[model samples]
Target: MTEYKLVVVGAGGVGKSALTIQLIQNHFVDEYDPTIEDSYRKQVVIDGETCLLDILDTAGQEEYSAMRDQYMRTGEGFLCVFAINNTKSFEDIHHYREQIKRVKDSEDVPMVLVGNKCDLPSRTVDTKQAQDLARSYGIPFIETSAKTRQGVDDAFYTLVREIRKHKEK
Candidate 1:
């Protein structure tokens, strides 16, 4: 089976761990703990092909900023997550995207612009605006709610497809 190294990134409190755990464990974590770093492995079928996913869940806190480069170097695909209710978290997505490009030394790396927390009542980031940004970056944009498991699989599966398409060229 092919293994994909996927990295999850975003600012603190934006539910990065929530999303990752939702995908891997199929449950939502109500409590928030500032993650230092965590790794998870799972076997699944994507597009009828079985593959191993080595997902790296990274810290969103600024204190762990020093560790970003190491994982950025090795990740084959990235999910740049942001909270729809928090505008600042949405703005922070650019830094993660740019940093990944810098580390990988490629502008066209496999990535997905993920706007999480879509289940919330209030949303500061509009869907069209997020779609525009993703279009500008030439990547797929997905809105996910870790709490309700909305679009969770699509976010990860889309990234895997992006990596496959990137590899084809």
Candidate 2:
């Protein structure tokens, strides 16, 4: 049985797949090629409790848009991802958040605002800006680099912890 379902969503190339791939496969992906549908399952141990995590790495494309709401409905948590170097990607995250809230029918769903591509030299989106937005939603904000593996695990772990804690309550 799946204990949690998490969906990684962002703009076309915000490293959503890279972040998901890095956490699931434990490797760095310099080049991320997206598919129509991708899913991963990993058994995670949080606070001595083992639970299955069903992760969906979506392409954020029109073809795969139909399944997004379904995933959101069943999902227990979300990794609202964006590229630190791309402000447009960061700006579009609220739309994703709105969809999640609409489908899940809850404002306090376990969520984490993920700033990906921190390994890049030029950054358009500031960490504080992301953190402020996340704080407004009462969610944790984290910066991650799929290349350097910085905060990649932490992002997933934080969301998992939130989900587990929410489950217990």
Candidate 3:
């Protein structure tokens, strides 16, 4: 059996919960009405091995700021998400890098930065910025959309596999 703890993080309206729900439950948030204070967990089987998945779904609002560490402690890895159409959410990758460090108490945990909402190409933010941001953190990165399920599975699976691979080495 294998165990994995992954955190999906971002500020309000960046679709952290939406992404987590999409990945864990295969459910999508139909409307964008945003809120915080939610969490979920699920077990999965990969290659005949049982994998325990502990996922922390966080709020992007200010009031729930204090609950960060609880999620951080469970994150063996993470998906730092930002909205592709919203530069503000993209800009937040800087803050998220530090926040992950504070929560995990290590600078070395594996992570993948996601440029969410990639289906809206007309509203897209520059791809170079995301790549540069990922480089700065020395982590893998991807662009994903929950609405289209674009790169969703690969984003989580790739990072988790990398984490497990590195652990074995």
lDDT string, candidate 2, 11-128, tens digits: 8888878877787888878776776568898997876878788899877654465665676788788888899999998889988888788887886788899998888979999889
Worst 10 residues of 1 by lDDT: 60-69
Candidate 1 residues lying further than 4 Å off, grouped into runs, are 61-67
**Best candidate according to TM-score:** 1
Better of 1 and 3 by TM-score: 1
Number of the candidate with higher TM-score, 2 or 3: 2
lDDT of 3 by residue, 17-111 (tens): 78888977798887754665565767787667678777777665444555556667667777888988999888777887887788767867788
Task: Give the count of colliding residue pairs in each prediction.
Answer: 0, 0, 1
TM-score of 2: 0.91
CA RMSD for every model? 1.7, 1.8, 2.4
TM-score for all models, in order of appearance: 0.93, 0.91, 0.85
For model 3, the superposed segments whose C-alpha errors exceed 4 Å read 61-67
Residue 53, model 1, lDDT: 95
Candidate 3 is scored at a TM of 0.85
Q: Write the per-residue lDDT of candidate 1 for residues 11-122, one digit (tens) a residue.
A: 8888888888887888898986665578899999999989899997777544455565767878888988998899898887877788778877987999999999898968
Q: Rank the models by TM-score, top first.
A: 1, 2, 3
Candidate 2 positional error at 67, Å:
3.6
